């Protein structure tokens, strides 16, 4: 035995959150990820811990209130990678009347309950603003920003910390009930190595693949349909120097964000495009670009063209199919389904579930699995502090504290370590006492010490894991520098 309490198939945010909650109640957990942690939807998001202002218009009170209250649980769990942000909503009275704005903002304020985030205000825009002169009024409120892919990584580390196991580049190929137990077969996507495990419980947390895993992996009927709704983002040099996010009301009733990113960039997104096909094939199309540039360019004085775009990304929302005609109207609430056979081998399956609500989702899931597990521990994550999160202060205090402790660190590198690794920064730096102890410089202060640390402690296997998921150094490294990172990973993981 040899036999796991629980196998979690999926290593995006909901599968990592489930596995981590389960490990911390004393279940023996294995989490399986076909490629890299957060390689799909969980690295393609707008990167916001948000209440979901636009969902109020659709009466989504359970979601908005749960999500609103979770902002502050998450900012305490992961202050290394999550922080407060202010959003500016410009007034477009022809679309929504001030009196209506002014009411939703009240609900946003008191629907979840907020120990700490500031409340909403009105705004005037003058001749000197970043917005076109004919926009003269707006509103400002709070929500949060989170490094989505690194929130997934922090949960995976939590799994291992609590004695669970995490395998990546390992695709589950089937799961079947036999003699009271699950048999889970999986294969290593590079070497072909086959694996078979037994488990007492199974989680299908494969996001856009949830129904396909029922169809091809289990030959079981899926309790729910999935709607795959593509959304894309574009990235430009920062459109202004302000620290605030803008939330823009487009003529179709959608909202589009303009978010400060890494002090140097702005992210513009997103879109709601019905999608069919392979979720791994998803990429931005011409009309998404035209659509995003349109709502930006009709609101701001400094005009962007297509040639300004430095990077794009795209992903598919796996939304529980509530059958709505309009992709923007489909609920963003999640549904969990649990099913046993003869009171044994439960199947927990996950439909939908935004990054904002993963922790609650995960706790709901364990609740449903509880009858099947012995002297299973109680709930515990609201009070936990994720790996990296133990920083005693904010990100910026911590970076100043790192540079005091390790004075060979430039202020930019200290900032990067504090904002990425948080309290794991001391494990990365090890016995380093100079710049030169960090090893090969791969560019933009991405040193061998970081990269080795990423392989040893963050499941990095290929350049993109390191450069696009654990970090966003891919934004600065040239093609030759990125290929040297791959060459190094081959040599080191040989
Ligand atoms: C455009 C966009 C913007 C968004 N913005 C926000 C936002 O601002 N705030 C917010 O809270 N949410 C946001 N979301 C929603 C959020 O990103 C998703 O709800 C969330 O990431 C879903 O994660 P998941 O774990 O359920 O799916 P994923 O974990 O991402 O997908 C399944 C994962 O499991 C693995 N897997 C799949 N099948 C198998 C298998 N057969 N065997 C082994 N492994 C497998 C994969 O490889 C895959 O990565 C956004 C979503 C989109 C699309
Ligand atoms: C227009 C004279 C009052 C000055 C306030 C600035 C304009 C923003 O005022 C807005 O005007 C709209 C009508 O055009 C209404 O639909 C909105 O609810 C109102 O708040
Ligand atoms: C305190 C916030 C809650 C207010 C309840 C809704 C009434 C808001 O009313 C709005 O205020 C604006 C400012 O003078 C006007 O331009 C708009 O005509 C009016 O609709
Ligand atoms: C479909 C949207 C209409 C909702 C029905 C409510 C009637 C809206 O009426 C509005 O009420 C406001 C106070 O709440 C006033 O400030 C506005 O000037 C008034 O037009
Ligand atoms: C009495 C029941 C009425 C519930 C309807 C809630 C109306 C929420 O309206 C919301 O206002 C926000 C501004 O704060 C906008 O950003 C959103 O687009 C809009 O949906
Ligand atoms: O440092 S943690 O314990 O939180 C995670 C360690 C993970 N190590 C691996 C080493 O090959 C992946 O980085 C796999 O066990």
Element (H, E) at 89: strand 82-90
The residue whose C-alpha atom lies closest to atom 1 belonging to ligand 6 is 457
Q: Ligand 6 mean position to 156 CA, how many Å?
A: 9
Q: Identify which of 420, 135, 143, 100 has the alpha carbon closest to the alpha carbon of residue 257.
A: 143
Q: Which atom of ligand 6 is nearest to the CA of 165?
A: 15
| Beta carbon of 104 within 6 Å of any ligand 5 atom | yes
Q: Ligand 6 mean position to 456 CA, how many Å?
A: 5
Q: Identify which of 68, 83, 78 has the alpha carbon closest to the alpha carbon of residue 13.
A: 78
* Residue 242, helix vs strand vs coil: coil
362 is in an annotated binding site: no
Centre a 10 Å sphere on the Cβ of residue 43 and count the other Cβ atoms it contains.
22
To one decimal, the resolution in angstroms is: 2.1
Q: Ligand 2 mean position to 90 CA, how many Å?
A: 12
Say how far apart CA 484 and CA 442 lie, in whole Å: 7
Say how far apart CA 41 and CA 434 lie, in whole Å: 39
* Residue 255, helix vs strand vs coil: strand
Q: Which atom of ligand 1 is nearest to the CA of 172?
A: 42
22 is in an annotated binding site: yes
Q: Please, what is the Cα angle at 358 between 352 and 359, to 5 degrees?
A: 150
| Beta carbon of 427 within 6 Å of any ligand 3 atom | no
Q: Ligand 1 mean position to 429 CA, how many Å?
A: 31
| Beta carbon of 102 within 6 Å of any ligand 3 atom | yes
Angle between helices 13-23 and 358-369 (to 10 degrees): 50
Q: Which two tokens stand for residue 463?
A: 């350049």
Q: Where are the domains of the chain?
A: 1-81+148-225+321-390, 82-147+226-320, 391-461, 462-494
- How close are the terminal C-alpha atoms of the chain, in Å? 31
Q: Identify which of 100, 6, 104 has the alpha carbon closest to the alpha carbon of residue 55.
A: 104
Rg (CA), the chain: 23
| Beta carbon of 456 within 6 Å of any ligand 5 atom | no
Question: Which letter does DSSP use for residue 38 in this model?
Answer: T
**What are the DSSP E strand ranges found in 133-241?**
137-146, 165-167, 170-178, 181-188, 194-204, 226-237
Q: Identify which of 147, 195, 137 has the alpha carbon closest to the alpha carbon of residue 169.
A: 195
User: Contact 87/141 with Cβ under 8 angstroms?
Assistant: yes
21 is in an annotated binding site: yes
The burial of 59, by beta-carbon neighbours within 10 Å (0-12 exposed, 13-18 middle, 19 or more buried), is given as: exposed
Q: Identify which of 13, 25, 19 has the alpha carbon closest to the alpha carbon of residue 158.
A: 19
The preferred substitution site among 50, 52, 57 for testing ligand 5, maximizing ligand atoms within 8 Å of CB, is 57
Q: Ligand 4 mean position to 96 CA, how many Å?
A: 11
Say how far apart CA 299 and CA 309 lie, in whole Å: 18
The residue whose C-alpha atom lies closest to atom 17 belonging to ligand 5 is 54
Say how far apart CA 64 and CA 70 lie, in whole Å: 10
User: Contact 3/198 with Cβ under 8 angstroms?
Assistant: yes
Q: Give the pairing type, strands 48-49 and 137-146.
A: antiparallel
């190094």: which residue's tokens? 488
Q: Ligand 5 mean position to 58 CA, how many Å?
A: 8
389 is in an annotated binding site: no
Question: Which letter does DSSP use for residue 490 in this model?
Answer: H
Ligand index nearest the alpha carbon of residue 100 = 5
Q: Which atom of ligand 1 is nearest to the CA of 352?
A: 19
What's the CATH code, domain 82-147+226-320?
3.30.9.10
Q: Ligand 5 mean position to 88 CA, how many Å?
A: 15
Q: Ligand 4 mean position to 109 CA, how many Å?
A: 21
Q: Which two tokens stand for residue 81?
A: 């990678």
Please, what's the b/e burial string for 94-123 (b: 16 or more CB within 10 A of its CB; e: otherwise)?
A: eeeeeeebeebbebbbebbebeebeebeeb
25 is in an annotated binding site: yes
| Beta carbon of 46 within 6 Å of any ligand 6 atom | no
Centre a 10 Å sphere on the Cβ of residue 404 and count the other Cβ atoms it contains.
10
Centre a 10 Å sphere on the Cβ of residue 165 and count the other Cβ atoms it contains.
16
Say how far apart CA 384 and CA 367 lie, in whole Å: 18
Q: Ligand 1 mean position to 9 CA, how many Å?
A: 13
| Beta carbon of 70 within 6 Å of any ligand 1 atom | no
How far CA 91 is from CA of 132, 342, 365, 374, in Å, comes to 12, 58, 40, 56
Q: What is the DSSP string of 418-432?
A: HHHTGGGHHHHHTT-
Tally of CA atoms within 13 A in the half-sphere of 27 that contains its CB: 30
Residues within 6 Å of ligand 2 by CB: 91, 93, 97-99, 136-137
Helices (H) and strands (E) in the chain, counts: 13, 18
Q: Identify which of 254, 18, 43 has the alpha carbon closest to the alpha carbon of residue 146.
A: 43
User: Contact 229/272 with Cβ under 8 angstroms?
Assistant: yes
Q: Which atom of ligand 5 is nearest to the CA of 102?
A: 14
User: Contact 151/12 with Cβ under 8 angstroms?
Assistant: no
Element (H, E) at 347: strand 344-351
Question: Which residues 6+ apart lie within 8 Å of 31 measured at CB?
Answer: 7, 8, 10, 11, 15, 16, 19, 156, 159, 164, 165, 166, 167
Structural method: X-ray
The top-level CATH class assigned to 391-461 is mainly alpha
Say how far apart CA 272 and CA 317 lie, in whole Å: 9
Q: Which atom of ligand 6 is nearest to the CA of 457?
A: 13
How far CA 25 is from CA of 29, 56, 269, 388, in Å, comes to 10, 35, 38, 21
201 is in an annotated binding site: no
- The architecture in CATH of the region 1-81+148-225+321-390 reads 3-Layer(bba) Sandwich (3.50)
Question: Which residues 6+ apart lie within 8 Å of 193 measured at CB?
Answer: 187
Tally of CA atoms within 13 A in the half-sphere of 18 that contains its CB: 34
Question: Which residues 6+ apart lie within 8 Å of 265 measured at CB?
Answer: 235, 236, 237, 238, 310, 475
26 is in an annotated binding site: yes
Longest CA pairwise span in the chain (Å): 74
| CA torsion angle 290 295 297 299 (round to 10) | 180
Centre a 10 Å sphere on the Cβ of residue 417 and count the other Cβ atoms it contains.
24
How far CA 272 is from CA of 168, 233, 325, 356, 395, in Å, comes to 30, 11, 12, 19, 33
What's the CATH code, domain 462-494?
6.10.250.1890
Q: Identify which of 265, 258, 341 has the alpha carbon closest to the alpha carbon of residue 295.
A: 258
Q: Identify which of 119, 101, 102 has the alpha carbon closest to the alpha carbon of residue 110.
A: 119
The residue whose C-alpha atom lies closest to atom 2 belonging to ligand 3 is 102
Q: Give the pairing type, strands 344-351 and 137-146.
A: unpaired
| Beta carbon of 458 within 6 Å of any ligand 6 atom | yes
């599968």: which residue's tokens? 15
Helix, strand, coil percent values for the chain (each to nearest 5): 35, 25, 35
Backbone angles phi, psi at 255, to 5 degrees: -115, 150
User: Contact 164/30 with Cβ under 8 angstroms?
Assistant: yes
Say how far apart CA 115 and CA 108 lie, in whole Å: 14
486 is in an annotated binding site: no
Q: Which atom of ligand 5 is nearest to the CA of 141?
A: 14
Please, what's the b/e burial string for 277-309 (b: 16 or more CB within 10 A of its CB; e: otherwise)?
A: eebeebebeeebbebbbebbeebbeeebeeeeb
Q: Ligand 4 mean position to 104 CA, how many Å?
A: 13
């Amino acid at each position: 035995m040899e036999t796991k309490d629980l196998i979690v198939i999926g290593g995006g945010i909901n599968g990592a959150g489930i596995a981590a909650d389960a490990a911390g109640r004393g279940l023996s957990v294995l989490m399986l990820e076909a490629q890299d942690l957060a390689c799909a939807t969980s690295s393609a998001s707008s990167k916001l811990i948000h209440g979901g202002l636009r969902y109020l218009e659709h009466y989504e009170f359970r979601l908005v209130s749960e999500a609103l209250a979770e902002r502050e649980v998450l900012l305490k769990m992961a202050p290394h990678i999550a922080f407060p942000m202010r959003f500016r909503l410009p007034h477009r009275p022809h679309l929504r009347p001030a009196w209506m704005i002014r009411i939703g903002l009240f609900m946003y304020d008191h629907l979840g309950k907020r120990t700490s985030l500031p409340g909403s205000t009105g705004l005037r825009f003058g001749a000197n603003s970043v917005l076109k002169p004919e926009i003269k009024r707006g509103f400002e409120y709070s929500d949060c920003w989170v490094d989505d892919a690194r929130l997934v990584l922090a949960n995976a580390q939590m799994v291992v910390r609590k004695g669970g196991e995490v395998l990546t580049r390992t695709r589950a190929t089937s799961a079947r009930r036999e003699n009271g137990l699950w048999i889970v077969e999986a294969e290593d996507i590079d070497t072909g190595k086959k694996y078979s495990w037994q488990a007492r419980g199974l989680v299908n947390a494969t996001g856009p693949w949830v129904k396909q895993f029922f169809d091809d992996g289990m030959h079981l009927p899926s309790p729910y349909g999935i709607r795959l709704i593509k959304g894309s983002h574009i990235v430009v040099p920062r459109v202004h120097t302000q620290k605030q996010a803008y939330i823009l009301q487009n003529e179709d009733k959608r909202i589009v964000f303009v978010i400060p990113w890494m002090d140097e960039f702005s992210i513009i997104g997103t879109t709601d495009v019905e999608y069919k096909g392979d979720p791994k094939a998803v990429k931005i199309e011409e009309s998404e670009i035209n659509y995003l540039l349109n709502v930006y360019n009709t609101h701001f004085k400094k005009q962007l063209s297509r040639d300004d775009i430095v990077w794009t990304y795209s992903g598919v929302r796996p939304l529980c199919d509530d059958e709505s005609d309009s992709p923007q109207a489909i609920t963003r609430d999640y549904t969990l389904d649990i099913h046993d056979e003869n009171g044994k081998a439960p199947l927990l399956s996950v439909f939908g579930g935004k990054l904002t609500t993963y922790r609650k989702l995960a706790e709901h899931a364990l609740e449903k699995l509880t009858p099947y597990y012995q002297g299973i521990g109680p709930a515990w994550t609201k009070e936990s502090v994720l790996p990296g999160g133990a920083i005693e202060g904010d990100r910026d205090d911590y970076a100043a504290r790192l540079r005091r402790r390790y004075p060979f660190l430039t202020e930019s590198l200290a900032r990067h370590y504090a904002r990425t690794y948080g309290s794991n920064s001391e494990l990365l730096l090890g016995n380093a006492g100079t710049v030169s102890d960090l090893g090969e410089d791969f560019g933009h202060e991405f040193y061998e010490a970081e990269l080795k640390y990423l392989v040893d402690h963050e499941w990095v296997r290929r350049a993109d894991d390191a450069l696009w998921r654990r970090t966003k150094q891919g934004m600065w490294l040239n093609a030759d520098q990125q290929s040297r990172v791959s060459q190094w990973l081959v040599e080191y993981t040989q």
